Amino acid sequence: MMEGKEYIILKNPIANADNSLIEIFSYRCTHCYDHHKFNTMGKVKEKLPNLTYKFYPVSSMGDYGRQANEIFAFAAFKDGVNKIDPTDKNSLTHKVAKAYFNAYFKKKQRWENGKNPEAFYSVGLKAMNVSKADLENFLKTPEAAELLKSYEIANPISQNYGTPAFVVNGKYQIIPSAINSPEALIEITKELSK
């Protein structure tokens, strides 16, 4: 509960993020994979059901960060329409992250280092069971523009301590040395979110 020990105050806050825990992550981030395997954010949601939980991908990370942002924005949008929390293991967000984490870390896939975005999109499109056209049409919408703009802030936040980064109410990033357990993450989030 002390600035500079458990948390820092972001110089610029995430817009529209009151009463929320947001995980800034990358598909090519190993600890992000760990936190997905043990569904950390889902554990927080269980103990703090009334917060909003989001995942902000980091477009500046990986050869395909910019394409991943599109796919995750589409998953977030659809999870929203479907009223499934993105920390739910049945969400499209979770299914998409699982597929990319699996591909990147277990299969050591790199999709030709940036030269084959079609193969990269396909992992996410298959995971969501939608077509490339669905994605192209989503990307024409204002809802897509808003999600993709909101994700821009994940890039400067990721430079504070790397990924994953945990941001509460859009204003405070939990300092990673303070997160010694999901219990600690929950306690800190509960303190910072009131």
Author numbering: 1 to 194
Manuscript text:
The bacterial proteins of the Dsb family catalyze the formation of disulfide bridges between cysteine residues that stabilize protein structures and ensure their proper functioning.
The entire length of the polypeptide could be traced for CjDsbA2, except for the C-terminal HisTag. The active site of CjDsbA1 was observed in the reduced form, while the CjDsbA2 formed a clear disulfide bond. This was due to differences in protein purification procedures. In contrast, the CjDsbA2 experiment was performed under native conditions (without DTT), as the CjDsbA2 reduced form did not bind to the Ni-charged resin. Additionally, the observed effect may have been caused by the prolonged process of CjDsbA2 crystallization (several months) and spontaneous air oxidation or, alternatively, by a photoreduction in CjDsbA1 during X-ray data collection. Redox potentials for both CjDsbA1 and CjDsbA2 were within the limit characteristic for monomeric DsbA oxidative activity (−60 mV for CjDsbA1 and −116 mV for CjDsbA2). We observed that the CjDsbA2 activity in this test was slightly higher than that of CjDsbA1. However, in contrast to CjDsbA1, which in cells lacking its redox partner, was mainly present in a reduced form, the lack of CjDsbB led to almost undetectable levels of CjDsbA2. The extent of CjDsbA2 reoxidation by EcDsbB was rather low, and it did not complement the lack of EcDsbA in either performed test.
